[PDB]
Design a protein around this ligand. Sequence first.
Ligand SMILES: [Mg+2]
Ligand SMILES: [Mg+2]
Ligand SMILES: [Mg+2]
Ligand SMILES: [Mg+2]
Ligand SMILES: [Mg+2]
Ligand SMILES: [Mg+2]
Ligand SMILES: [Mg+2]
Ligand SMILES: [Mg+2]
Ligand SMILES: [Mg+2]
Ligand SMILES: [Mg+2]
Ligand SMILES: [Mg+2]
Ligand SMILES: [Mg+2]
Ligand SMILES: [Mg+2]
Ligand SMILES: [Mg+2]
Ligand SMILES: [Mg+2]
Ligand SMILES: [Mg+2]
Ligand SMILES: [Mg+2]
Ligand SMILES: [Mg+2]
Ligand SMILES: [Mg+2]
Lengths: 53, 260, 188, 155
Amino acid sequence: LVTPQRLQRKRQQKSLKIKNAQAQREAAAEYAQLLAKRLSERKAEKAEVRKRR
Amino acid sequence: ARGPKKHLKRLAAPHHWMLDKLSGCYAPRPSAGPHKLRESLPLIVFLRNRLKYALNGREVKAILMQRHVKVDGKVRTDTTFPAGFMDVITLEATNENFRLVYDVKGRFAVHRITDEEASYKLAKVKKVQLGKKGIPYVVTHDGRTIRYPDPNIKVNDTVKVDLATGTITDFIKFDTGKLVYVTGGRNLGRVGTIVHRERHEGGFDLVHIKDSLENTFVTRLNNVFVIGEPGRPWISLPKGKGIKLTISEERDRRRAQHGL
Amino acid sequence: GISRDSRHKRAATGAKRAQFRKKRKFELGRQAANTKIGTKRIHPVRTRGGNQKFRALRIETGNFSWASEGVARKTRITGVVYHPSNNELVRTNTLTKAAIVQIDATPFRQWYESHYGQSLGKTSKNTERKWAARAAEAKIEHAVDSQFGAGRLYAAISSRPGQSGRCDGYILEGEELAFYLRRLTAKK
Amino acid sequence: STELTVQSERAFQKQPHIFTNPKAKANRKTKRWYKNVGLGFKTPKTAIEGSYIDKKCPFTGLVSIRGKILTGTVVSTRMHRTIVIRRDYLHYVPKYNRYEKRHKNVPAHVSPAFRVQVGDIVTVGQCRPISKTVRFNVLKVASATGKANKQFAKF
RNA sequence: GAAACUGCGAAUGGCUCAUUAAAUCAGUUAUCGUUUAUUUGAUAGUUCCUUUACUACAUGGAUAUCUGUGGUAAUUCUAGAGCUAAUACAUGCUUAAAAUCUCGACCCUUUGGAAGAGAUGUAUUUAUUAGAUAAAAAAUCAAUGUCUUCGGACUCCUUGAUGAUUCAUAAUAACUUUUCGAAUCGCAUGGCCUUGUGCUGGCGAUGGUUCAUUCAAAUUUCUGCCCUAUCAACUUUCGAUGGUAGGAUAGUGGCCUACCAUGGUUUCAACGGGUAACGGGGAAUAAGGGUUCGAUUCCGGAGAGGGAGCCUGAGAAACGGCUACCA
RNA sequence: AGGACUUUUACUUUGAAAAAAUUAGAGUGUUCAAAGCAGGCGAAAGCUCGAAUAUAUUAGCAUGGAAUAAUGGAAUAGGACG
Ligand SMILES: [Mg+2]
Ligand SMILES: [Mg+2]
Ligand SMILES: [Mg+2]
Ligand SMILES: [Mg+2]
Ligand SMILES: [Mg+2]
Ligand SMILES: [Mg+2]
Ligand SMILES: [Mg+2]
Ligand SMILES: [Mg+2]
Ligand SMILES: [Mg+2]
Ligand SMILES: [Mg+2]
Ligand SMILES: [Mg+2]
Ligand SMILES: [Mg+2]
Ligand SMILES: [Mg+2]
Ligand SMILES: [Mg+2]
Ligand SMILES: [Mg+2]
Ligand SMILES: [Mg+2]
Ligand SMILES: [Mg+2]
Ligand SMILES: [Mg+2]
Ligand SMILES: [Mg+2]
């Protein structure tokens, strides 16, 4: 039977799924930016090694 | 036996639960959980025996059921939960917080440790792998699977889980000259500094450890848990700091520090 | 009841081992699939730890891959012509892994025609420019063209119909095909 | 004891899932896959450019070397693609404080990359169960001859 | 809150030592050779397929319990009839964007470059590719890419782990009698006012794919067993040792099949026979060395009268589970 | 921390390992003891030290030593270095 509590559960499930997906994509973006920063740092280090040598 | 075994006779329980060889035929078998049962510690043992807050099984059941035990920020209402090494046990009653660290005799000693640092936990990295969709992840000794770790975190390393969000806060890189703890064998509870780590191509790494008293031993790498930098441990080490005083030195401690 | 334990075998020395224990369930072996051709009939079997296995007796069509340009197509198996283990399976048309079968070969044919259009056996400007960029690089070897004119391709199955339930494999091509023709010419 | 034909049997002999593209015009010999078993063990050049197949090759086959490393002496090289190694040792009887010469016969699987004969001391390594009795793969022929390196005498 | 359906355990525990002499077992390894309910930590938009016509404010039918009629001498024997439910059995819906692949209504003379259209979650199976890495410069033809401040420069290329991998993982083409992707429960029921049953909304409980972790389970390396030669050769047509391919296995493996090779153990005692032999931790005994015992309080193994066979499950060849033979 | 070659052992020192119970053995007035892993001390107003150690003589792993015991180099130089 259709009950406001059942609709509440359905809405909660949908919202939890959407929020979890958003959080996962945000974490992926943050990890990508961290990788880019580390890559820039070690590329600068490699350039300095090439220049000094 | 055809299938899993679900009973632990009292003599077969580890000598670190260090129960009474009489007054019972069986011993609490730890349920499946974050730690090996040989290395873990059931909550019933920690409360009934170590703390004496309870008296027997029913009292421990009543304690756990009403949600006063909090293992690493979670309730864990099962009697034989394997609260293992470096886990945090919180009792809002008596507002007390414990962290399980071996005392140098090699046993899960009762370590009353402050609320402020009880927020976080330490962990050893046991695996670093790449799960589905190319997502890096790290498996600690608790079995915690931390997703998206720092790119230069390697195996055998140590990490500082915030224990609230359950994400990575800081980490310590394994290398020589570093404060370290031991979690197996004769050197249980010992704390020292890594002097050398001989590789031994083909398996079973070994590390040499020198403690503050300038004593030296050697232990397996699986057996090793980096705990911080010398002079600056990242946690509150228990009483004695794991120096492993000699039996004669322990006798001298009993004689000297003595007031009745 | 078919056991695969080492106890019933004699020792390396040759002594006859006495029976140590009656054979267990984690040592069982099941009946051979000995699959056939026609009227797809796959039977599920519940093995250890769930993990449905699929017996693929009486299988007619399956996926087949071409390694050179690397394209896979669903196509019909039409009989088995060679088996490296037992020719009795060939005579009984039993289809197991590594068996050598014939292929209807049409889907590869009009894929080639819509991909290069070389009219084996003997438009929009975009497609024409794609073909020009290809620049007749489709110089695939002569024997596969010979059986393309024949119409039946020579494929070697690589999936295990006994376990997987599928019927996947790859066309003999390159020196591979050569070798097997020699063996087939030995049969011929 | 090795056939001249690179495949002699009914089934074709290929290294599984390494494919040489005939449509390409490089026209090298083939695409031969290989690996190093580690432990500072040098892969033989006869395996690096060889044309054998040997599914159970530690250097070219699927089998991996892990576990025990045993040094012994060849006692039987005259059963196909496999070796029988005599390992000698001394068992210590303590009631007499005396030792006792003893020997065990370890079967193993020597790759065609190695040329073995009766009497060569051999370093062998553990692997998966290959046959009913062989569990070791020959990893090094230390003494190719031992005392037959110099044979003739012409002053 | 009976009963019954559902779920879970019943494979733990307890007992005995009959079988078993490289068998079990002990110490020590390995699984880059596999399955793993549960516990713990994470984990998924795509179920649309041409989306300009659908139940998602909730899809269908049975079915026990029960109401009544019986049968048999009886058994935890149950046939017929009548309703009835689900986290039982079946179906099935949303739902974004993005990017990547593929196929083109055209133009304008090349550096060709573009309207636009379909597919892509995961799961399975098969092919192929990436998964790098000892170190400074070139010329050159062949192909042809960016910018051109029309000389030509190409400077930038990202790559984890182990000792090792075809590993982890990613990518392309496809495949599937198409697995999963919450139609499930409890408490509290707050906030927004778009003031309506409207929009949202917390703490849990069960589930649920995958990957880990744990309880494990299977195999597995080296070495170790009592007496006996009045047991010296043993094994292979019926697998004995190895090769290859296949089948089966959860997985390696003569584990089984097909075709080959004729091999494997042995005076360092193999093979056979005996054990009033389960192995061990241990017990008695005690100058030292030892001798005897260990069915039994712990760890392993095996068995449920002797034998075989099997359903259910994650786990049984279970026996206070079934099938058959023998007693 | 990397390529490079590693004569191989037997032997012996040290260490990691050899589950608990058992044996040994430390502390402890179970009234003593067999035992047990307990207990002790406050003013009585919660404060406490414990639950020690060793051995297993085999097999495996690491490690220092190089006497004793064995094997191997260069005799056709196909030997070693640049
Ligand atoms: Mg039992
Ligand atoms: Mg016997
Ligand atoms: Mg590849
Ligand atoms: Mg893979
Ligand atoms: Mg095979
Ligand atoms: Mg006995
Ligand atoms: Mg008996
Ligand atoms: Mg016994
Ligand atoms: Mg008896
Ligand atoms: Mg028992
Ligand atoms: Mg049984
Ligand atoms: Mg009876
Ligand atoms: Mg079950
Ligand atoms: Mg039975
Ligand atoms: Mg009974
Ligand atoms: Mg029973
Ligand atoms: Mg029954
Ligand atoms: Mg002991
Ligand atoms: Mg005593």
